[PDB]
Design a protein around this ligand. Sequence first.
Ligand code: HEM
Ligand SMILES: CC[C@H]1OC(=O)[C@H](C)[C@@H](OC(=O)c2ccccc2CN(C)C)[C@@H](C)C[C@@H](C)C(=O)/C=C/[C@H]1C
Length: 396
Amino acid sequence: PPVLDLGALGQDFAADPYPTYARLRAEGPAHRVRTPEGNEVWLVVGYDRARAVLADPRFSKDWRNSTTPLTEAEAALNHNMLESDPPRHTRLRKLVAREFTMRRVELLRPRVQEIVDGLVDAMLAAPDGRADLMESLAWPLPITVISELLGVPEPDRAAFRVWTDAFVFPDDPAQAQTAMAEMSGYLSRLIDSKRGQDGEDLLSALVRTSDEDGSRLTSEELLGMAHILLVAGHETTVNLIANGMYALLSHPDQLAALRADMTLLDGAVEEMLRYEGPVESATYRFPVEPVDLDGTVIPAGDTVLVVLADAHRTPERFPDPHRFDIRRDTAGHLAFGHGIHFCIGAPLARLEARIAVRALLERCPDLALDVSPGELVWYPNPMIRGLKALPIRWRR
Ligand code: HEM
Ligand SMILES: CC[C@H]1OC(=O)[C@H](C)[C@@H](OC(=O)c2ccccc2CN(C)C)[C@@H](C)C[C@@H](C)C(=O)/C=C/[C@H]1C
């Protein structure tokens, strides 16, 4: 067909892109499109095709295989595991795998609970029983966790809402590059601040690993690792919490069910990921050779987006897919990807989301959405499903 312009679809396409994705899926697996930002890319839609492409080594994540150029500021930060293939990817992920196991992340539970308690206390102080859930919770909890973990001092953390705000929804191209340069310069000064201080946080550890053996972790990869750990876990966990609570509060049958039986909570969190998880499309992939998908040939070097949102509405794989149902069999969702890059952070994402959902339900009586769904505004980006705000209210 021709290329399909997505920016030239309404705020409607941002508010509910799923029917567009479903229509493409009925035509085939791979489609050339143009993003609202302006970029010519491929979409891959359909569960079985998504799953497969995420795990197919012909699809590289190394920008050396892309025909798309990076700016200087972007180049300085691509020395990370998510934008690598084996063997670099293998080497890099070994350095932090131990820190993100289920058993190790469980040790954080008391602290995370303590962070959520304080954030909810503060919220419930509001005199008119209303708040924005983003400002009060979905946003502060994950920065706070990832910031203690890596050793970002308190005063420096606000900057991150601004820097990542510009990576998602900039005012223009040039401010994304400025944020990037600004963030890179800050992570170097932070990294240097750790050297020689004998600190026991994750970033001090990495500084020591790099200093001990530059071939295991170069100083560009050291920066890249700090960068990826911050970003990758933060834009995503924020919007999971926010979207997830939005799904629950816009499906009051399901909210009631979970109140009545809080053993259902983990299952609910998984269905929050399946139904409206923050990663709408996976991160860029570039074919190392022409790749044929039901007779559509995607050329070597092109940018390919696996549309996870659409794999999640594929009825052959998720029955009655438009239904939000916290008891559903969710095993096999691709919210955390699939394959060698499967999310390193998932045990932490889950731990925070489970604790936040439960605190809200247990401490807010008659908790409720404080606008209509049609009033909410979603960020247009086809890679990130997220709200501008989430007005709620409760009794008192
Ligand atoms: C709701 C929470 C989260 C979601 C939905 C999410 C999603 C994902 C997805 C889909 C990928 C794979 C992307 C691809 O293959 O293109 C990924 C990779 C990754 N995530 Fe997450 N993530 C979340 C939380 C976190 C957290 C909390 C961290 C870090 C603390 C984190 C760190 C990473 C890293 C480092 C990778 C790259 C791993 C690799 O290349 O081997 N994520 N995540
Ligand atoms: C689940 C993984 C997260 O994705 C990322 O961290 C990717 C790799 C990051 O990508 C880039 O850094 C990027 C993306 C496109 C072009 C150039 C670059 C520069 N890079 C080579 C250092 C960009 C897309 C960050 C934004 C959109 C975000 O908050 C994403 C949050 C999640 C979706």
